[PDB]
Amino acid sequence: QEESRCQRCISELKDIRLQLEACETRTVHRLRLPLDKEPARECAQRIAEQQKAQAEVEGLGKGVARLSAEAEKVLALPEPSPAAPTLRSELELTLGKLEQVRSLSAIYLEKLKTISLVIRGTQGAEEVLRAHEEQLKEAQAVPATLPELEATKASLKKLRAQAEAQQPTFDALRDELRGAQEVGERLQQRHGERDVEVERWRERVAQLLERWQAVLAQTDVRQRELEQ
Incomplete structure (x- = not known):
């Protein structure tokens, strides 16, 4: 009439391991998908989505804890049980899969967060560089008068100071990219998945x-022309 707790626990363990494997496959398919033409927005959205995915996995982990407790209760009954090895085997497979999916979820979330910093940082650098590149271009014009020459020279002095001051921005950008690369490598090494995003x-x-570098170098050339 009523199935044994042993058989029911075996069934539930198989079921929850399939749900974990599905979380796993879902995550692989996501991390294989490169960002498209709105990387900032997409990356924020995917981070939000992966945070939920990770929470779904933790809910499954609580199911696994509940099934493990039940399994051990069954396995502790003194009577002979030829099914016991199957129950043990299925428990250990489910526990292993849980850790594997937890790991993968966390590292992919980490990969997204590091990439997000590089994306933000590069978009910020673009807007500053555009301003500096335009100031430089304007300084390329031949001045008409001795006083305009002095204005051009003053514009270049300012530009050099402003451009030199971006040193922290580019140091942080390089560090952020290093961070992103390292995460990708660990995902590769631990889960065998290549990094589809970092080359971009x-x-x-x-x-x-x-x-x-070119703003700095060409500012220096232009300043030197106007001195001699």
Whole structure:
């Protein structure tokens, strides 16, 4: 009539392990998807989504704890039970899967958060560089008068000071990209999944650095022209 607690526990353990495996596959499919053409917004949205995913996993973990307690109660009865090894085996598989899915959920969330810092940081650097690149372009004009020359020279002095002052911004950007790269590598090493996102932002950072270096270098050239 009523099935044994042993058989019911085996069934429930298999069921919850399937739900964990589904969380797992879901997460793999997400982390394989590169950001598209609105990376800031998409990344914030995906972070929110992954925080929930991670909470769903923790709810399953509480189910696993409940089934583990029940399993151990059954396994502790003194009577012979040829089913006991199956119950033990299924418990240990479910417990292992839980840890694996927890790990993966946490590292993917971490990957998203580090990428989000690089994205924010690069978009900030763009807006400052644009201002500086325009000031420099304006300083390229030939001044008409001796007084305009002095204004151009003053504009360049200002520009150099402003551009040099961005040192902290670019140091932090490089650190953030380093952070993002390291997370991706650990995901690769621990879960065998390549980092589909980091190359885009490595290139972004590299180009922005080069533009910053060029503002500094060409400001110095232009200042030197006007002195001699």
